[PDB]
Amino acid sequence: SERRRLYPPSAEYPDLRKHNNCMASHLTPAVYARLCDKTTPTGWTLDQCIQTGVDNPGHPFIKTVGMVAGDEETYEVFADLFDPVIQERHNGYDPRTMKHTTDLDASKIRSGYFDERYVLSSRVRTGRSIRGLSLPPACTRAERREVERVVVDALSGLKGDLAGRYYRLSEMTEAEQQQLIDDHFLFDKPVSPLLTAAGMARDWPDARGIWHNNEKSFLIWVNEQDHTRVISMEKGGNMKRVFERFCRGLKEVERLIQERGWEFMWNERLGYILTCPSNLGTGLRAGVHIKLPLLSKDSRFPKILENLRLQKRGTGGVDTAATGGVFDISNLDRLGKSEVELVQLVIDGVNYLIDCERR
Amino acid sequence: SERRRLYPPSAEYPDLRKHNNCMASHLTPAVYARLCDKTTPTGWTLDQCIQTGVDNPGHPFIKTVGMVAGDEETYEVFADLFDPVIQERHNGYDPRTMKHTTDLDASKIRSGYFDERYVLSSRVRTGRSIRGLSLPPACTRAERREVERVVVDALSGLKGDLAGRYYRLSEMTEAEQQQLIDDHFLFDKPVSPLLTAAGMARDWPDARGIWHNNEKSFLIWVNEQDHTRVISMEKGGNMKRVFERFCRGLKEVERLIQERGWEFMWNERLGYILTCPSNLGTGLRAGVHIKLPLLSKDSRFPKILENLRLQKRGTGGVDTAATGGVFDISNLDRLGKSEVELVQLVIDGVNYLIDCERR
Amino acid sequence: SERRRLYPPSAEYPDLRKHNNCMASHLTPAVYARLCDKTTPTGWTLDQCIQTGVDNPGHPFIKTVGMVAGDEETYEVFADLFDPVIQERHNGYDPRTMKHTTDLDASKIRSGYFDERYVLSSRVRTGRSIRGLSLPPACTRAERREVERVVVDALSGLKGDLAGRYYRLSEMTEAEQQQLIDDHFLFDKPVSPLLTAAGMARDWPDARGIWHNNEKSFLIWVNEQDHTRVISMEKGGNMKRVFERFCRGLKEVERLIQERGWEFMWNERLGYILTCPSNLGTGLRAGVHIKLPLLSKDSRFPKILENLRLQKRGTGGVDTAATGGVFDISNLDRLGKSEVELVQLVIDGVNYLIDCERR
Amino acid sequence: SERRRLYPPSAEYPDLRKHNNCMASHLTPAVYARLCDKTTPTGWTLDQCIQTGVDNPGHPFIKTVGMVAGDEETYEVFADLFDPVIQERHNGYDPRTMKHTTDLDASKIRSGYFDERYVLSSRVRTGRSIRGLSLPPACTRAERREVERVVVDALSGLKGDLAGRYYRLSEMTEAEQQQLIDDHFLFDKPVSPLLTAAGMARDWPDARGIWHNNEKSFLIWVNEQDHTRVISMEKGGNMKRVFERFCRGLKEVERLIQERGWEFMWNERLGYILTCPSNLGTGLRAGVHIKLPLLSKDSRFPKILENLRLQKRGTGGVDTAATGGVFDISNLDRLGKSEVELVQLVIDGVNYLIDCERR
Amino acid sequence: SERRRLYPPSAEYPDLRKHNNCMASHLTPAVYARLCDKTTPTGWTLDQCIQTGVDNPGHPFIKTVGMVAGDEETYEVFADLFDPVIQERHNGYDPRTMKHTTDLDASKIRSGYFDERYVLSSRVRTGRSIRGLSLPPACTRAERREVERVVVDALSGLKGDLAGRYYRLSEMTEAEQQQLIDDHFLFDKPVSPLLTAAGMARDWPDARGIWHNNEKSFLIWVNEQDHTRVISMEKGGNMKRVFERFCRGLKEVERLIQERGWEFMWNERLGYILTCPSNLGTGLRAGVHIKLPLLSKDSRFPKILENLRLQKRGTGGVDTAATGGVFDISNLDRLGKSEVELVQLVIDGVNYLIDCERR
Ligand SMILES: Nc1ncnc2c1ncn2[C@@H]1O[C@H](COP(=O)(O)OP(=O)(O)O)[C@@H](O)[C@H]1O
Ligand SMILES: Nc1ncnc2c1ncn2[C@@H]1O[C@H](COP(=O)(O)OP(=O)(O)O)[C@@H](O)[C@H]1O
Ligand SMILES: Nc1ncnc2c1ncn2[C@@H]1O[C@H](COP(=O)(O)OP(=O)(O)O)[C@@H](O)[C@H]1O
Ligand SMILES: Nc1ncnc2c1ncn2[C@@H]1O[C@H](COP(=O)(O)OP(=O)(O)O)[C@@H](O)[C@H]1O
Ligand SMILES: Nc1ncnc2c1ncn2[C@@H]1O[C@H](COP(=O)(O)OP(=O)(O)O)[C@@H](O)[C@H]1O
Ligand SMILES: CN(CC(=O)O)C(=N)N
Ligand SMILES: CN(CC(=O)O)C(=N)N
Ligand SMILES: CN(CC(=O)O)C(=N)N
Ligand SMILES: CN(CC(=O)O)C(=N)N
Ligand SMILES: CN(CC(=O)O)C(=N)N
Ligand SMILES: [Mg+2]
Ligand SMILES: [Mg+2]
Ligand SMILES: [Mg+2]
Ligand SMILES: [Mg+2]
Ligand SMILES: [Mg+2]
């Protein structure tokens, strides 16, 4: 009969004593019990949200979040757990009291030029989901293929310097993909436990690819970690030009996507909705590489970085260490501030770092 | 299991880039997604509402609405889409803030006499639904037959000059129906794509007919485009008399219909509920034919017509062009203003047109 | 409460006294009552099946069926009504006792050459549905677009003489489409009441097009009346060559469609499932045009045609009359016999007609 | 409404053109469509069954199955797909026509002694599930903890030479676990994509451990890849003694588990139910290491191995290559034959290999 | 969501290692798992059936069954567990292969007279349920009151020597009830754990009472342990007369109960349905007291008793020991054999015991 009893929520509670994710810092038995039975309309559950954080006590190179979203409803169905995490992840930003404003106008940028001797590369990046389609962690094969078709068709309409063709991973050979990776264009097959535990590596490489303009200064990653990933790169230190191309291409892509009736996932309290709560808000991760020896003279590096709200990864990916001195220095926060604001902050921070080389 | 995913709403969104209906001007992906799952208690869905507008980019002779209603709940279940369309269709009339008043008293009419040399014919028209019965676009065979029986029985009680018999289309021969059509009494079999796409031509001619008084000055169309269509005609220019007969017969029909327990569909925010949102409000389309050469001297005709809120169709139906000069000039708006007001407006407008003949 | 009563089935029964479809000849109140409540898993109902036959008493040029299918389940959910109709439509073929065999090998063809002076054109045709997708009468916009994408992608893999590109109707201009029509390649916009009543003209021209090889001797119609329509044409009388190309291209298309995981709708009792029960079985309609005066010497034409199981339409479509003498003479039955058998029958019949010209 | 359509099954079908699992060799669109909607009572779906095979085209060292089970119902709910795979995996064994017999009596063993100079190590292994508890691929945290408690309590009752204590992975230090691994006692953290794709690495290391007797000749792995894994090891070539201890301890464990009311999952058609269909039947993988140079003189090794139904992995795990010559040679089939039969087959095969060293 | 898992059946399995009921001898984890979810239409579950046996390892004076029924469906809903227990309880009587015959004709009795010096008292007893009313273990207050009213009204119609009035326990004083108890007429308040664990003591003494004829030779117990308990007593050894009165009164009670439309629970495979499976079949427990010293000369008493299928309780109830020598000797089996057969067996057995006094 219905007299049969279920396992009490505490019987399922994760053992997070040794873990260090930002999820474990905020998952309490009360919250887990509250959300144990809920679910998003597509079947996403809390356990699926917190699985990746549960499996990984921490990351060797940078503090993580520990949870991913399955669709747009997750950020509201499971808000009670997420909002404290989003607040902690983005320094002092309540995701239930204040709103988020997005400005993609590069005309307001200042300076934007780095000492080419010290910065080498200049990149900007973002991401965009498609409403009505499950996010990569939870998306089925059909949903992923639908995302791929929508973006491929929409991007086919781009004209001018932002013109190219879409190369599907299933077509590229190992050598070509490896060359694109080593060139810092393509994305790597997901082997990190933080991605495979979240479910973002199912059915690889099906329905995933890259669309890059002829000069490869404007790239789009389809179905790697997010639905979309709009990158603009230029080997140099003219952040202004790369950012200008990035925003122009972003506006064009948005136009050509809405022309077909689709719309990018978005809500006022959060901005563009992305899988990992780290990327919430603007998704923007404007940043540069750095000449090794010039910035290799750094004693209190992490303290200054934290003061400047800058992340320090390795040249080769977040999952790699910095060798020789080349530090992939990017911005930390993505939500709350606007894209122009974040890029100006990155410009000021990197210029400050250059001024502090003091060889 | 239930893990199977549905086609996202955008995957169904219509391709209305080239269309020009008033539906396409107001259907946005947000609205379509919102109403994608809803339905009226009888099974009417949004796609069924917008199908006719989807199929027809536009009409060669006059701007259209593009959607039809299935029953009375449609105007509330799918209000989010309709209300902007009703507002645009009837110049500046919010269907969710202001109310509608109906006055069917011809004693307040003034003048009402046209120059017979220039107007030829004088007609008034309206329509009336029956509560509890699905509208023609969605009505089943049994519902249509029930409507026919209700109106036939109720109208059988009419006495006096408004006295006649009901001729069922299934009984009339081709010659008789053709003569009535060419005489401007009967209605034509639905062949226009704007009607067949809406579903108002199923099971033709079953359960449809005409009831005309002995002098044919008072006609009722049963189950052609609406449940009811109460027309009063007189070959001449005495709009006052035709309108007086129209309102008197309308009151008598209403009385004899309520006597049996039925009631005409009606709500304060909209007035009498009719299929095509063009006819909402009063359903009244008082108008006249016109002598050709006298009004054939017109240079800026459409501008003056739009100024006077008058529609210009052809002598033979909205689906026909005006040849020789005979312009079927009627009123445009039906909701917001009262029947007496609309008829007085038509009188003033047509008299103004006559005064502007200036041969 | 639930004490409320529904309209009895007889209250909905269609008035088919004057109609002449093959549906009306077999729809009885018992059958209508039995299937009144049933439905296919996708929502297809009996009334939707019989609507087109209800609306059209008959066709001016050839006897019709009167019903269409919504998906593959319809032929089993509503079998009680269909099977007598399929039996009558295809002379003496029970669709519930005997099986259907399909053979698409042109190597077994004999003769295959006509007197070019008398036949002019040589065409073969068929159709193919996609499993899991609703048929054109019932298909939604998303389903139609999915069909279009599946066939476009699959056909893109064709190589050799069967090589071309897919032209979408939304792209072709009016002049180009008209030229293709008059050339007997493209299909006409649906205006016939027998098609618009069935619902096969919704959302026109969205998601519909034609893929023709470079020489246009191999064409595919996407989303006009069926999911697929594989035509092979050659202006001449070498039926053998056109049929060989037709079958080879059909096999290649099937291969390239299954490569992606899809499959053509098919069951042993019926063969390939198509919308109009006339086309059930093989869908094959091999036939030729005819020189006018040579076959204009015919006294008892319909009797001989019925003897030979050949249909006689007009040069320009089934919805047109034969003028000058050019008679579009094709085969009647499609189910029960195999494609090779039907084509050999057409060859023998047309050769017999030529032998009977007897000028 | 319910008129909304689902993604057709083919729209979800995996792209297995390049894959080489035994799953892809037998997954057809018909089967996938048939089982697309089904599910086991605990929520296991077909996509979850085939995910691991989908993600991995193949394994570098040995042919795989490609699917895992979620519970005991999976082998019946999804039988249509599994049974051909089980038939192929275990040479010519229909899992729906013939039955399986298990005999765990070592008294019937013959010889059982190897040339210690050539075999080094002698091990036997198996596995056992617990009825009512979800298998590791699908098990929740509470279910895994319940399994751990059941086995820990039951095994606590063992007495005699089969006496020890249970060490929980969460307690062991990195050095101790590494030493046990290198000693060939403990299991390695799951990093192989064939295990992480299946979901058998969630919540690691929670609720997992090893129970080994004082001499470590009898080990039990709790919650690594199966519920249970009963290994008996002895550095030498006396397979008879190790197998005797293995079967005696297995019988004792079964007794002490049923004493508490639990029961090992088991059905006649399949024997003990285990996750990977490779291990179905008896779970037994009796096998030995081998001296390198003595068997390094091998030309047509794989042909003889296939003739002898023996698998050849590396000394260090299936996920490692054989270096120096030490070949981890085990038995292939597990279902159909009995444990005594399989062990005798391994004995004969390894003795044959020794006789064929022919230095 | 529904992903939450229930406690596996084994997690609920009772700990019956030390118990000795006939339930524990036949409850296996397979059976418990099978019936874990089932239930009778009134909500009776297996756990409720086996609770009393679980709580009581055994009875000090006689072997028990360990389970009770909640209604008539229990013996079919939970037949898998009961049937072996009924088979063991009633020596060699399958409750699913053979049928039961009831004969209540005392005219076929022989002898029926005991040596008054050795037997003292002569009693017969039975019980009868009311169809449609839950049995005492599961009955609610309203159901118990309904049973009481039905039996009181039906018995009010008795006339002749079987004539009396019904005394309600709520009306009797402590002294009167105690005197009736010590006189061996009334029943004792339930304090034995074997009754209170079953739930047959709820709401005591509400809705329970005794109806005894004027001479108290015919008594009926209402709502003590069963719905009905029809006892006939006579201080003496004329079993024939007491049994004759018992059967006559039973027939009269049955008649007067069916007159009102009710019916005694009964099925062919089991006979009259009673709570404790010990009483199944006829419910008959004809038996006598015994003079102490005459039968106090007994060495192998239990062996002879088991040979003769006779139970030996104490003078004062089954929950009391036999002191002085007065042994309440009754019959054991109730199902399979008929009432006349059982009474003749008791007569023969007690006469045999008297013959074996051999003082
Ligand atoms: N500033 C940069 N210049 C050049 N390449 C970059 C830069 N930032 C990231 N990349 C490239 O992106 C890939 C992975 O980026 P990652 O560190 O994961 O950032 P994100 O998550 O924003 O993509 C690597 O191949 C790396 O070469
Ligand atoms: N003023 C008029 N005089 C005569 N006939 C008219 C007039 N207005 C409309 N009709 C008749 O109405 C029929 C269709 O009119 P239509 O344009 O559909 O107006 P409505 O939509 O109000 O019916 C035609 O057959 C036409 O003869
Ligand atoms: N034998 C033929 N030769 C040339 N054109 C043909 C032939 N048969 C059909 N057509 C063309 O097909 C179009 C419509 O064909 P239709 O009569 O509807 O046959 P189907 O239903 O098989 O398509 C017309 O434009 C017509 O020109
Ligand atoms: N015959 C053997 N002798 C010694 N160690 C073994 C033997 N077989 C397996 N192992 C040990 O088992 C571990 C993994 O075994 P694996 O190849 O996964 O087999 P299984 O799947 O049966 O556990 C390794 O650490 C390996 O050292
Ligand atoms: N042969 C008998 N003579 C007198 N009283 C009896 C006899 N058998 C039973 N009783 C009375 O029945 C009561 C309980 O009997 P019990 O052992 O429960 O038998 P049952 O289960 O058939 O009622 C006691 O109070 C006892 O006095
Ligand atoms: C690197 N990140 C960001 C994070 O989780 O903090 C990934 N989600 N992979
Ligand atoms: C002519 N009209 C009015 C309209 O749609 O605007 C019809 N609904 N047919
Ligand atoms: C011409 N046909 C065939 C038929 O219906 O008989 C169409 N279904 N349109
Ligand atoms: C090594 N195996 C066996 C197999 O899948 O064939 C695992 N299931 N991991
Ligand atoms: C004495 N009995 C009989 C039995 O359970 O065996 C009771 N059910 N109380
Ligand atoms: Mg990255
Ligand atoms: Mg009209
Ligand atoms: Mg055609
Ligand atoms: Mg292993
Ligand atoms: Mg008793």
Side-chain angles (χ1 to χ4, degrees), chain B residues 121-123 125 181 183-186 188 221 229 233 285 287-289 313 316-318 328:
Chain B
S121 100
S122 153
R123 173 185 110 146
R125 200 255 319 157
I181 280 161
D183 291 347
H184 302 349
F185 296 129
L186 178 57
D188 40 299
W221 287 341
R229 231 86 183 279
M233 302 213 315
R285 202 173 78 80
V288 296
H289 283 9
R313 330 171 156 183
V318 68
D328 174 357

Side-chain angles (χ1 to χ4, degrees), chain B residues 77-79 81-87 89-95 98 100-102 104-107 109 111-112 114-115 118-158 160-173 175 181 183-188 190-213 216-233 236-238 242-243 245-247 249-250 253 255-267 270-290 293 295-296 298-299 301-302 304-305:
Chain B
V77 162
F78 300 105
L81 159 61
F82 277 66
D83 301 59
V85 173
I86 285 143
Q87 191 163 354
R89 175 65 188 69
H90 302 101
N91 64 330
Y93 179 92
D94 176 272
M98 322 173 297
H100 173 60
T101 39
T102 88
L104 280 71
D105 169 44
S107 89
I109 195 167
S111 147
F114 292 141
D115 187 314
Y118 294 47
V119 288
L120 315 183
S121 100
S122 153
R123 173 185 110 146
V124 189
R125 200 255 319 157
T126 183
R128 289 294 183 282
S129 310
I130 305 304
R131 201 167 246 132
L133 287 160
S134 291
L135 291 174
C139 73
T140 80
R141 252 169 264 110
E143 269 179 296
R144 205 183 292 118
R145 296 153 159 159
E146 183 89 40
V147 173
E148 193 221 20
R149 286 180 313 212
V150 168
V151 201
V152 162
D153 302 350
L155 283 278
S156 182
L158 273 161
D161 45 311
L162 310 82
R165 73 184 298 277
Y166 159 92
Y167 314 73
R168 146 177 327 111
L169 250 57
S170 175
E171 331 193 310
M172 307 211 249
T173 187
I181 280 161
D183 291 347
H184 302 349
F185 296 129
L186 178 57
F187 47 79
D188 40 299
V191 288
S192 155
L194 266 69
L195 274 35
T196 207
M200 298 185 240
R202 287 153 16 246
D203 324 299
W204 195 273
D206 198 49
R208 331 183 178 228
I210 178 162
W211 180 97
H212 61 72
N213 79 316
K216 287 196 214 297
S217 71
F218 194 83
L219 312 98
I220 283 82
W221 287 341
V222 185
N223 283 326
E224 170 258 7
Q225 194 279 88
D226 229 316
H227 279 150
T228 325
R229 231 86 183 279
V230 156
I231 312 131
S232 175
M233 302 213 315
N238 193 0
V242 195
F243 170 53
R245 178 177 42 250
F246 151 76
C247 49
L250 191 41
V253 174
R255 208 188 45 72
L256 281 152
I257 282 277
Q258 319 204 30
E259 294 237 359
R260 179 49 29 51
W262 299 87
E263 262 185 326
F264 287 150
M265 297 185 136
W266 180 98
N267 72 63
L270 286 186
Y272 303 90
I273 286 295
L274 304 180
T275 56
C276 167
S278 66
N279 298 320
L280 276 199
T282 64
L284 175 138
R285 202 173 78 80
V288 296
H289 283 9
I290 274 286
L295 288 220
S296 89
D298 42 329
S299 325
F301 213 39
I304 308 188
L305 254 70

Side-chain angles (χ1 to χ4, degrees), chain D residues 7 20 39-40 46 57 66 109 112 131 138 144 146-147 204 224 286 302 315 326 337 354 356:
Chain D
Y7 268 109
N20 196 68
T39 179
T40 66
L46 165 58
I109 195 167
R131 201 167 246 132
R144 205 183 292 118
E146 183 89 40
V147 173
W204 195 273
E224 169 258 7
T315 282
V326 189
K337 305 233 170 317
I354 297 302
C356 279

Side-chain angles (χ1 to χ4, degrees), chain C residues 313-329:
Chain C
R313 330 171 156 183
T315 282
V318 68
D319 319 314
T320 79
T323 81
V326 189
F327 303 123
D328 174 357
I329 279 139

Side-chain angles (χ1 to χ4, degrees), chain E residues 275-290 293 295-296 298-299 301-302 304-305 307-311 313-334:
Chain E
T275 56
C276 167
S278 66
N279 298 321
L280 276 199
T282 64
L284 175 138
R285 202 173 78 80
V288 296
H289 283 9
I290 274 286
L295 288 220
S296 89
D298 42 329
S299 325
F301 213 39
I304 308 188
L305 254 70
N307 176 349
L308 304 166
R309 317 212 51 62
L310 311 180
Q311 181 164 135
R313 330 171 156 183
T315 282
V318 68
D319 319 314
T320 79
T323 81
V326 189
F327 303 123
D328 174 357
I329 279 139
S330 89
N331 82 318
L332 179 64
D333 40 6
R334 323 214 210 283

